[PDB]
Amino acid sequence: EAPAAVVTGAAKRIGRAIAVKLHQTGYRVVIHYHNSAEAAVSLADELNKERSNTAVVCQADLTNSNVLPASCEEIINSCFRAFGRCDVLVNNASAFYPTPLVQKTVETQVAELIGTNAIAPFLLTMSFAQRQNLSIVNLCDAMVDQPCMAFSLYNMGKHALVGLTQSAALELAPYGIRVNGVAPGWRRKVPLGRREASAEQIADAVIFLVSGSAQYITGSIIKVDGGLSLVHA
Amino acid sequence: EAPAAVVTGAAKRIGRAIAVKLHQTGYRVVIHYHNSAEAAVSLADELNKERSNTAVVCQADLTNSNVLPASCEEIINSCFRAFGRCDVLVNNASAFYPTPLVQKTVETQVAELIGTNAIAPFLLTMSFAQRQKGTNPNCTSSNLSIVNLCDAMVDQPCMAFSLYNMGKHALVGLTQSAALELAPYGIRVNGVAPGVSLLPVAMGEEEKDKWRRKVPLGRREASAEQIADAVIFLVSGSAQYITGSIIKVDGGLSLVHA
Amino acid sequence: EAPAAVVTGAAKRIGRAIAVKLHQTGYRVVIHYHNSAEAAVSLADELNKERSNTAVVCQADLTNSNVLPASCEEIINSCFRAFGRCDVLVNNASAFYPTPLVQKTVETQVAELIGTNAIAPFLLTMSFAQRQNLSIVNLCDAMVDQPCMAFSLYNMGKHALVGLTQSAALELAPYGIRVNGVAPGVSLLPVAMGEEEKDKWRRKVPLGRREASAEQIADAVIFLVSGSAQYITGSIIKVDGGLSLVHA
Amino acid sequence: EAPAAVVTGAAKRIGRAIAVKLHQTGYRVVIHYHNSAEAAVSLADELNKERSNTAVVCQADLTNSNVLPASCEEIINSCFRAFGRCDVLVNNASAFYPTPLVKTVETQVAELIGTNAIAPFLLTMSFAQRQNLSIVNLCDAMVDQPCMAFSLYNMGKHALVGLTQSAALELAPYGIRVNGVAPGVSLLPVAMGEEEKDKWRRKVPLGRREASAEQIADAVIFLVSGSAQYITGSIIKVDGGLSLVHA
Numbered sequence: 001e002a003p004a005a006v007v008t009g010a011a012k013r014i015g016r017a018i019a020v021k022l023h024q025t026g027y028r029v030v031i032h033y034h035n036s037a038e039a040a041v042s043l044a045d046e047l048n049k050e051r052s053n054t055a056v057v058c059q060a061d062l063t064n065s066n067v068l069p070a071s072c073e074e075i076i077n078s079c080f081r082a083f084g085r086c087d088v089l090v091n092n093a094s095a096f097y098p099t100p101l102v103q104k105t106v107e108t109q110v111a112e113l114i115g116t117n118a119i120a121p122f123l124l125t126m127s128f129a130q131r132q133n134l135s136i137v138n139l140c141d142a143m144v145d146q147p148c149m150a151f152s153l154y155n156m157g158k159h160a161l162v163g164l165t166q167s168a169a170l171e172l173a174p175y176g177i178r179v180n181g182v183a184p185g186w187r188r189k190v191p192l193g194r195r196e197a198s199a200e201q202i203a204d205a206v207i208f209l210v211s212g213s214a215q216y217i218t219g220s221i222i223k224v225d226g227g228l229s230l231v232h233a
Numbered sequence: 234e235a236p237a238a239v240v241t242g243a244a245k246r247i248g249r250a251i252a253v254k255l256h257q258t259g260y261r262v263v264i265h266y267h268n269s270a271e272a273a274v275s276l277a278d279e280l281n282k283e284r285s286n287t288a289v290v291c292q293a294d295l296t297n298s299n300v301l302p303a304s305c306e307e308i309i310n311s312c313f314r315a316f317g318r319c320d321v322l323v324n325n326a327s328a329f330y331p332t333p334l335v336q337k338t339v340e341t342q343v344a345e346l347i348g349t350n351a352i353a354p355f356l357l358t359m360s361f362a363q364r365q366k367g368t369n370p371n372c373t374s375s376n377l378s379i380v381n382l383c384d385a386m387v388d389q390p391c392m393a394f395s396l397y398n399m400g401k402h403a404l405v406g407l408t409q410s411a412a413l414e415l416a417p418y419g420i421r422v423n424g425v426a427p428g429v430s431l432l433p434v435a436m437g438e439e440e441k442d443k444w445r446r447k448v449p450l451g452r453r454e455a456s457a458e459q460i461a462d463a464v465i466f467l468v469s470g471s472a473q474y475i476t477g478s479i480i481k482v483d484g485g486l487s488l489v490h491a
Numbered sequence: 492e493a494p495a496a497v498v499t500g501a502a503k504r505i506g507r508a509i510a511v512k513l514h515q516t517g518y519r520v521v522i523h524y525h526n527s528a529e530a531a532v533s534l535a536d537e538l539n540k541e542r543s544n545t546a547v548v549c550q551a552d553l554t555n556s557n558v559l560p561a562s563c564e565e566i567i568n569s570c571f572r573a574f575g576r577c578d579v580l581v582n583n584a585s586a587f588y589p590t591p592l593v594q595k596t597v598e599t600q601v602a603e604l605i606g607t608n609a610i611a612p613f614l615l616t617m618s619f620a621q622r623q624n625l626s627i628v629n630l631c632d633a634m635v636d637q638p639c640m641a642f643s644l645y646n647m648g649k650h651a652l653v654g655l656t657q658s659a660a661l662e663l664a665p666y667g668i669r670v671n672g673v674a675p676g677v678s679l680l681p682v683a684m685g686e687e688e689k690d691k692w693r694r695k696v697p698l699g700r701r702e703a704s705a706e707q708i709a710d711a712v713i714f715l716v717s718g719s720a721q722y723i724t725g726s727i728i729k730v731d732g733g734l735s736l737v738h739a
Numbered sequence: 740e741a742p743a744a745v746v747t748g749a750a751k752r753i754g755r756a757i758a759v760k761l762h763q764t765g766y767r768v769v770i771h772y773h774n775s776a777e778a779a780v781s782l783a784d785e786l787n788k789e790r791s792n793t794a795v796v797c798q799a800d801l802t803n804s805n806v807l808p809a810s811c812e813e814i815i816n817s818c819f820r821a822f823g824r825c826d827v828l829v830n831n832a833s834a835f836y837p838t839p840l841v842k843t844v845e846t847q848v849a850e851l852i853g854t855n856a857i858a859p860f861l862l863t864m865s866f867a868q869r870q871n872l873s874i875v876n877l878c879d880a881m882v883d884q885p886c887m888a889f890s891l892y893n894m895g896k897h898a899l900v901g902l903t904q905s906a907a908l909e910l911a912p913y914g915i916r917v918n919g920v921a922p923g924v925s926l927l928p929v930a931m932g933e934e935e936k937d938k939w940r941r942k943v944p945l946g947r948r949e950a951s952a953e954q955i956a957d958a959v960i961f962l963v964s965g966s967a968q969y970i971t972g973s974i975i976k977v978d979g980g981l982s983l984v985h986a
């Protein structure tokens with residue numbers, strides 16, 4: 001039977017490119033969305049036209065709250081209901097905006113930036129593991145140690161996601177679940193800037209990590225940034 | 234006039250050693266505590282007996298909630314109310330317990346582990362920096378800094394401690410992000426990262442010795458004073474160009490392979 | 492035509508598996524060796540039996556010395572002589588043994604451990620770049636920051652190789668050359684190591700309690716040289732089963 | 740009795756400030772130098788005027804070669820001959836210049852890798868064999884965002900991080916701590932135009948200035964002190980936040 005994958009924030013941009021490549025590789029896909037229902041269904045339509053009944057959508061707000069654990073349980077359950085299995089979880093959904101230290105309430109910003117970027121991946125990881133070539137791929141940040149000015153909460157959530165990638169790789173290794181990261185990265189600064197950055201390049205690294213060609217790789221974060229993290233101020 | 238410091242979780246153990254050494258160095262100190270009221274008051278009493286009116290206590294829960302920003306503002310405000318200034322913030326308080334991925338509510342665990350280790354340090358950092366805006370300038374003798382208590386083992390985490398390790402990773406992120414953003418205000422932001430220091434009071438001696446035997450330098454845990462020494466260096470004039478640095482105080486533990 | 496690759500220390504073990512997988516992917520290969528002449532020639536024979544004129548051997552000592560630049564130049568020149576091009580360089584050859592701080596001359600140990608692990612990759616990188624989907628892959632070590640006791644010079648060499656990987660990625664990007672690393676943890680154990688000691692190392696690995704096969708290491712090299720990694724440069728991929736994440 | 744320290748490349752700039760601060764803390768010092776004899780002797784004379792018989796000089800080339808192990812043994816021996824003990828070794832001497840990928844290259848290898856990595860290793864060996872003991876290595880906070888065309892220098896500083904960690908592990912049972920101090924931008928070249936110096940200064944978040952040599956020395960003094968007794972294998976950045984700044 002065909003393996004199945006959940007991709008969060010899959011309606012647009014990087015998540016969409018990842019869902020497309022997984023589907024092209026032979027996966028059935030759950031396309032998670034929060035607000036982008038039209039785009040999520042448009043993508044499912046396109047994938048189902050290629051292979052009938054191989055793409056479904058799942059709505060969830062990934063902001064931290066009292067109901068986030070049940071929402072994340074539901075996303076994983078939707079994979080099992082549609083496809084009878086869940087082989088791959090891609091934690092792609094992300095919020096991104098500045099939160100200056102010196103001057104939405106700040107606690108709403110915490111619930112969004114830390115909740116979407118770190119807590120929902122944690123809850124999804126728990127639900128994926130509890131329900132069990134299995135693997136999880138977290139979308140990290142190549143610039144995590146040279147943060148953007150005034151992005152403290154965003155940077156904290158991306159740091160927490162490194163910690164989850166490493167902790168979950170160690171704890172889920174006995175279950176045969178690998179846990180890795182892809183870290184995307186102005187153009188004139190990128191060493192490989194002759195090539196334009198694309199969502200498909202990020203998806204290519206995800207496809208490698210979920211493949212049999214990465215069966216010994218766990219706890220690894222692959223930077224896909226054209227060399228930008230190497231460039232000094 | 235003597236400078237003033239806030240130390241979170243300062244009633245006992247490492248936070249107390251930090252408060253004691255700051256006080257011996259000449260600081261007035263706010264001893265924040267959550268549940269350890271008797272121990273906090275006992276410490277404040279000892280410090281005030283050494284020099285009158287140089288220590289106060291401040292009670293707060295640092296679990297995340299919609300009131301946490303007000304709590305953290307109030308901790309900083311307590312320093313200014315007692316002492317008229319706040320030169321140093323030490324983010325020491327920390328919840329620590331396992332949260333296995335495979336089997337309190339999990340949302341309570343998130344609020345405790347991520348709140349104490351990361352969100353409260355972030356809000357305290359916001360409040361510390363914001364309160365400096367009103368102060369008179371001291372362009373000649375000002376030495377403002379924040380020290381976060383990190384973990385030397387953050388990249389070799391303990392089994393089944395994902396939320397704890399996520400919170401400590403976020404604290405590294407805060408340390409570096411706040412160092413960049415607050416440098417223009419002359420506020421330095423650094424970390425001290427213990428490996429094995431004081432073992433839990435409830436841990437059996439056999440288990441404590443298992444941890445001690447891992448440490449290359451002396452096969453023993455760091456004393457609380459050894460952790461405090463690195464905090465004292467980072468707040469001192471001898472560290473005036475250091476910002477965004479995390480000093481491991483771990484006896485070589487993080488260098489040891491499986 | 493078919494692209495061409497140099498793999499150093501390719502007669503046996505991980506370098507052999509890399510040369511084989513590059514050849515299976517469509518590369519012509521230079522099999523570099525130092526002492527393993529019979530194994531190198533046998534491998535070239537096997538690869539040429541599959542596709543004629545797609546494999547050659549090249550012999551060189553990669554110990555540092557005043558002739559090392561000439562040797563490294565000649566390895567790259569051997570790829571151009573055989574195949575007319577050189578698209579990929581894999582720096583795999585490596586000396587590995589203890590050099591305790593407290594008690595071969597020590598200068599010979601320096602020349603061997605720092606030469607093979609760092610200086611030869613640097614000179615090979617210079618000659619590869621000068622002679623021009625181009626890329627270099629360096630075989631690093633996932634344990635570089637939790638080093639084996641009494642392996643100072645080896646560990647220094649591997650740290651220097653990380654610096655080279657990053658510095659050359661930065662400097663050679665304008666020429667379209669990507670430079671990345673693959674960092675094994677425990678892969679193929681030494682032939683001379685007893686079974687009990689091998690099992691000790693295997694038991695450390697979270698993912699499967701086993702060493703990486705040479706083929707698993709080669710799979711990461713194949714990815715990095717591929718069109719699916721064209722925006723990756725300066726990255727070191729650990730292939731370690733989670734070993735580097737395990738505390739004391 | 741007073742402890743003793745060897746500082747390499749101690750005639751000028753950061754090494755000089757280290758040697759002065761160690762001497763002010765109460766150490767007797769061996770001032771190693773390569774070409775700067777007049778400045779090394781001037782420093783020793785200044786320190787001996789302050790307290791008699793507390794400073795000597797030791798000349799050596801720290802380029803890698805057949806004779807480097809004997810040179811490094813002789814530097815450590817000079818401390819024992821003058822002062823009867825050697826408590827601290829500071830590996831500060833360093834060659835620094837570009838080596839573009841696209842002097843012979845093997846001379847550049849010998850100089851850049853010898854001064855930054857091989858000589859620290861051999862000095863570490865001789866220091867340990869001869870035994871609050873500690874070694875401090877002068878690292879580089881920018882080691883993972885290197886300057887364009889400085890591959891050999893960067894390789895040498897990466898190797899020095901590996902030495903700092905390997906030696907901390909191996910020498911811990913002997914009670915010898917091994918740590919690093921990693922400057923970002925500190926003293927710029929005297930000949931560098933102020934317009935270029937200002938380009939570097941403006942990069943630094945904390946004060947838009949370079950570190951003084953004395954600020955680097957303050958971190959060394961901490962690491963050799965009793966206040967760092969449990970610290971080994973640590974590298975302390977003294978960089979004003981520079982390493983945290985993205986391109």
Ligand SMILES: NC(=O)c1ccc[n+]([C@@H]2O[C@H](COP(=O)([O-])OP(=O)(O)OC[C@H]3O[C@@H](n4cnc5c(N)ncnc54)[C@H](OP(=O)(O)O)[C@@H]3O)[C@@H](O)[C@H]2O)c1
Binds near residue numbers: 092
């Ligand atoms: N773009 C880059 O260059 C870059 C750089 C570094 C890292 N990354 C990482 O790569 C991943 C994808 O990047 P991207 O630019 O494609 O992401 P993006 O478009 O900024 O957002 C990704 C998706 O996350 C979902 N999302 C946002 N807030 C949410 C919430 N509160 N609850 C539920 N879903 C929410 C959105 O889904 P709906 O639209 O359905 O609401 C959105 O489509 C992210 O993890 C990002 O951090 C990207």
Ligand SMILES: NC(=O)c1ccc[n+]([C@@H]2O[C@H](COP(=O)([O-])OP(=O)(O)OC[C@H]3O[C@@H](n4cnc5c(N)ncnc54)[C@H](OP(=O)(O)O)[C@@H]3O)[C@@H](O)[C@H]2O)c1
Binds near residue numbers: 266267383430
């Ligand atoms: N001990 C070690 O070996 C070690 C190792 C690595 C890192 N560290 C770090 O070093 C620091 C000091 O360690 P430690 O062992 O001394 O810490 P600890 O005893 O475990 O905790 C310090 C204090 O944290 C306060 N705290 C806990 N939950 C709280 C909450 N919800 N609200 C407010 N305060 C709360 C407690 O205050 P009350 O007692 O008043 O309730 C407690 O006394 C911590 O950040 C720790 O993570 C320590």
Ligand SMILES: NC(=O)c1ccc[n+]([C@@H]2O[C@H](COP(=O)([O-])OP(=O)(O)OC[C@H]3O[C@@H](n4cnc5c(N)ncnc54)[C@H](OP(=O)(O)O)[C@@H]3O)[C@@H](O)[C@H]2O)c1
Binds near residue numbers: 500502523525
């Ligand atoms: N095996 C592991 O578990 C492991 C772990 C971490 C990293 N690695 C890295 O992965 C790579 C492959 O490892 P491996 O175990 O397959 O390597 P290996 O068998 O120890 O050595 C590979 C080859 O290096 C060549 N070599 C040694 N000294 C040389 C010299 N002076 N001049 C020229 N060539 C020389 C030898 O060639 P001849 O046989 O032709 O003389 C040898 O066959 C190495 O870079 C290694 O550091 C391996």
Ligand SMILES: NC(=O)c1ccc[n+]([C@@H]2O[C@H](COP(=O)([O-])OP(=O)(O)OC[C@H]3O[C@@H](n4cnc5c(N)ncnc54)[C@H](OP(=O)(O)O)[C@@H]3O)[C@@H](O)[C@H]2O)c1
Binds near residue numbers: 754775776923924925
């Ligand atoms: N300056 C900075 O901004 C900066 C930044 C990052 C890291 N660092 C590190 O901090 C340390 C001190 O920096 P610095 O700028 O003061 O260094 P420096 O002036 O460039 O060099 C220090 C001394 O190294 C000695 N040296 C050079 N080549 C030598 C050789 N072949 N043999 C023996 N000694 C040799 C020279 O001694 P003689 O003059 O006696 O010949 C020189 O005075 C160095 O390790 C450096 O890499 C400095």
Ligand SMILES: COC(=O)C1CCN(C(=O)c2ccc(N(C)Cc3cnc4nc(N)nc(N)c4n3)cc2)CC1
Binds near residue numbers: 326329
């Ligand atoms: C249900 O509760 C449990 O299961 C306990 C048993 C498992 N624990 C440890 O393995 C463990 C591992 C390392 C430790 N330390 C090196 C000491 C220690 C002691 N107190 C601490 N307190 C805080 N806040 N943070 C720390 N990192 C910390 N660390 C301590 C305990 C502690 C929690």
Ligand SMILES: COC(=O)C1CCN(C(=O)c2ccc(N(C)Cc3cnc4nc(N)nc(N)c4n3)cc2)CC1
Binds near residue numbers: 586587677679
């Ligand atoms: C002359 O004496 C020797 O060669 C020593 C090297 C092997 N020893 C090990 O403890 C040891 C530790 C870890 C090992 N591995 C994880 C396997 C391994 C096997 N071959 C290798 N080859 C190279 N080049 N580099 C490596 N990192 C490497 N690694 C192997 C041996 C002790 C004996």
Ligand SMILES: COC(=O)C1CCN(C(=O)c2ccc(N(C)Cc3cnc4nc(N)nc(N)c4n3)cc2)CC1
Binds near residue numbers: 834835
């Ligand atoms: C052809 O020769 C050249 O092109 C020279 C001019 C180019 N250089 C610099 O731009 C440069 C960049 C940064 C610098 N610093 C941050 C100051 C500095 C000054 N002296 C040093 N000395 C050593 N040993 N190590 C250092 N890192 C060091 N660093 C200094 C010069 C140095 C070599």
